[PDB]
Enzyme design. Structure first.
Site, PDB file in Angstrom:
ATOM      1  N   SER A 186     -12.100  10.246  -4.108  1.00  0.00           N
ATOM      2  CA  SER A 186     -11.621  10.015  -2.756  1.00  0.00           C
ATOM      3  C   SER A 186     -10.099   9.950  -2.771  1.00  0.00           C
ATOM      4  CB  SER A 186     -12.201   8.724  -2.177  1.00  0.00           C
ATOM      5  OG  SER A 186     -11.754   7.597  -2.914  1.00  0.00           O
ATOM      6  N   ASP A 197      -6.633   8.024  -0.618  1.00  0.00           N
ATOM      7  CA  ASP A 197      -6.125   7.018   0.308  1.00  0.00           C
ATOM      8  C   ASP A 197      -4.976   7.604   1.126  1.00  0.00           C
ATOM      9  OD1 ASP A 197      -7.927   5.171  -0.791  1.00  0.00           O
ATOM     10  OD2 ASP A 197      -6.394   4.037  -1.835  1.00  0.00           O
ATOM     11  N   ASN A 202      -9.152   4.902   2.973  1.00  0.00           N
ATOM     12  CA  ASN A 202      -9.825   5.726   1.972  1.00  0.00           C
ATOM     13  C   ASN A 202     -10.820   6.687   2.609  1.00  0.00           C
ATOM     14  OD1 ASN A 202     -12.219   5.794  -0.410  1.00  0.00           O
ATOM     15  ND2 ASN A 202     -10.108   6.032  -1.107  1.00  0.00           N
ATOM     16  N   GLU A 228       0.813  -1.211   0.000  1.00  0.00           N
ATOM     17  CA  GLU A 228       0.000   0.000   0.000  1.00  0.00           C
ATOM     18  C   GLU A 228       0.852   1.268   0.000  1.00  0.00           C
ATOM     19  OE1 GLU A 228      -2.975   0.139  -0.715  1.00  0.00           O
ATOM     20  OE2 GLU A 228      -3.909  -1.758  -0.103  1.00  0.00           O
ATOM     21  N   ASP A 271     -12.598   8.047  -8.236  1.00  0.00           N
ATOM     22  CA  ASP A 271     -13.878   8.569  -7.764  1.00  0.00           C
ATOM     23  C   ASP A 271     -13.740   9.862  -6.969  1.00  0.00           C
ATOM     24  OD1 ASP A 271     -12.846   7.727  -5.290  1.00  0.00           O
ATOM     25  OD2 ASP A 271     -14.608   6.574  -4.742  1.00  0.00           O
ATOM     26  N   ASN A 273      -7.926   8.688  -5.815  1.00  0.00           N
ATOM     27  CA  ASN A 273      -8.687   7.662  -6.519  1.00  0.00           C
ATOM     28  C   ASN A 273      -9.514   8.288  -7.633  1.00  0.00           C
ATOM     29  OD1 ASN A 273      -9.187   6.380  -3.244  1.00  0.00           O
ATOM     30  ND2 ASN A 273      -7.759   5.553  -4.761  1.00  0.00           N
TER      31      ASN A 273
END
Ligand SMILES: [Cl-]
Ligand SMILES: [Cl-]
Ligand SMILES: [Cl-]
Ligand SMILES: [Cl-]
Ligand SMILES: [Cl-]
Ligand SMILES: [Cl-]
Ligand SMILES: [Cl-]
Ligand SMILES: [Cl-]
Ligand code: NA
EC number: 3.2.1.17
Length: 129
Positions: free
Chosen positions: A50, A52, A59, A35, A48, A46
């Site tokens: 959002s 992380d 998220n 990650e 969309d 992201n």
């Protein structure tokens, strides 16, 4: 802060993540490796909208507030910036909620694709724990 492999394993164990919800410490270290490469300051937008955050790339759609993810929730009740601290307490406490949500560590797509089913004990091998 960029953790060493055994250093992060030890911090995760101190914060109660070893065998949490049945997931051995090596699963958690493996997920953190892919990650964030063990970097607490990692962020990644992201598609969309959002974002992380942190060592486990938690998220903003569901888990933390960053003020710019429309329609999102903050189920860990924390600012997303808390997930970038050198102190991993906030990331660990929020990850405990995430892994309890129903699908286990499959919530982390990179864990499913790169850690699940592998020899995850290699990630804590040699460490004084
Ligand atoms: Cl490594
Ligand atoms: Cl363990
Ligand atoms: Cl393990
Ligand atoms: Cl928001
Ligand atoms: Cl909420
Ligand atoms: Cl906030
Ligand atoms: Cl820590
Ligand atoms: Cl599970
Ligand atoms: Na949010």
């Amino acid at each position: 802060k960029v953790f060493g492999r055994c250093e992060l394993a030890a911090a995760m164990k101190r914060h109660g993540l070893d065998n949490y919800r049945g997931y051995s410490l090596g699963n958690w270290v493996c997920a953190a490796k892919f990650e964030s490469n063990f970097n607490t300051q990692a962020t990644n937008r992201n598609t969309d909208g959002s974002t992380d955050y942190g060592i486990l790339q938690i998220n903003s759609r569901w888990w933390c507030n960053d003020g710019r993810t429309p329609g999102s929730r903050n189920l860990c009740n924390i600012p997303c910036s808390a997930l970038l601290s050198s102190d991993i307490t906030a990331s660990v406490n929020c990850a405990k909620k995430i892994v309890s949500d129903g699908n286990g560590m499959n919530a982390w797509v990179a864990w499913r694709n790169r850690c699940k089913g592998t020899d995850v004990q290699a990630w804590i091998r040699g460490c004084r724990l």
